[PDB]
């Protein structure tokens, strides 16, 4: 039974070869594709049967310019700063089959943060820098629970066990050592913290708050939005 093969050479560089045995191998590859295909539906159903949590979180650096410049002592002043996006969402539904108890999670979140950093570094040895950090976060979604029992239905929505930050305007600095990353505590002088909350419901309140230090009148300190850990936040606060 004839045996044959062929190949392609460019500049004398063989570019792969074709064989009848290769055709038979491809036939078995198609058979194996079928073999893999057959069991997929049961597997995919199996996870729904048991349930699980599904998480889909990109974390992408849209903006970043890093570099370094030397120093007179011979050390290296790292300099860099980035803008990043983490637009993912939490998901994953668990079904208690034959118990008819459905648990559902869906809460996409937004993490619009920014950092700038400068660092004098001693390669393989040590570092010293400061990190300029502006922050914007959001999340929203639903926590739902539905169960059918003995002809008695009930749709359950667990209440927030913590404030729901619609918006979060935050700015922070840090002192970072080779072995540590340390925040810089805010000044207590003119440490303005306030909150205004309105009732969406008797147990839930729409809250507007701002915590900051008003050091504008103090020299060497940037004005009230800056020079310290400054938070302007918009939240729904569960009263508990």
């Amino acid at each position: 039974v004839p045996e044959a093969r062929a190949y392609l050479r460019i500049l004398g560089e063989e570019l792969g070869f074709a064989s009848l045995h290769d055709l038979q191998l491809l036939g078995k590859l198609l058979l194996m594709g079928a073999r893999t295909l057959q069991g997929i539906p049961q597997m995919i159903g199996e996870v729904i049967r048991k349930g699980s949590k599904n998480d889909f979180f990109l974390h992408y650096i849209f903006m970043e310019n890093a570099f370094e410049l030397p120093t007179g002592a011979g050390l290296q002043l790292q300099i860099s700063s980035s803008g990043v996006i983490a637009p993912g969402a939490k998901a994953g539904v668990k079904l208690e089959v034959a118990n008819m108890q459905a648990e559902l999670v869906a809460k996409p979140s937004v993490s619009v943060e920014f950092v700038t950093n400068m660092g004098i570094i001693i390669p393989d040895f040590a570092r010293s820098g400061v990190q300029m950090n502006t922050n914007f976060f959001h999340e929203s979604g639903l926590e739902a629970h539905v169960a059918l029992k003995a002809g008695k239905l009930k749709f359950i929505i667990p209440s927030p066990k913590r404030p729901v930050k619609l918006l979060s305007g935050g700015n922070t600095l840090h002192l970072v050592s080779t072995t540590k990353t340390e925040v810089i505590p805010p000044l207590i002088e003119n440490r303005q913290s306030w909150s205004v909350c309105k009732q969406v419901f008797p147990g839930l309140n729409y809250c507007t708050s701002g915590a900051y230090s008003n050091a504008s009148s103090t020299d060497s300190a940037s004005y009230y939005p800056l020079t310290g850990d400054t938070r302007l936040e918009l939240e729904l606060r569960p009263t508990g």
Binding site: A73, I120, S128, A215
Partner: peptide, 18 residues
């Protein structure tokens, strides 16, 4: 004898110093 001290003057030069 030398030191590198990275800090903010607005908060009393709170700095990472070596």
């Amino acid at each position: 004898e030398a030191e590198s001290s990275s800090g903010v003057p607005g908060t009393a030069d709170s700095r990472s110093a070596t």
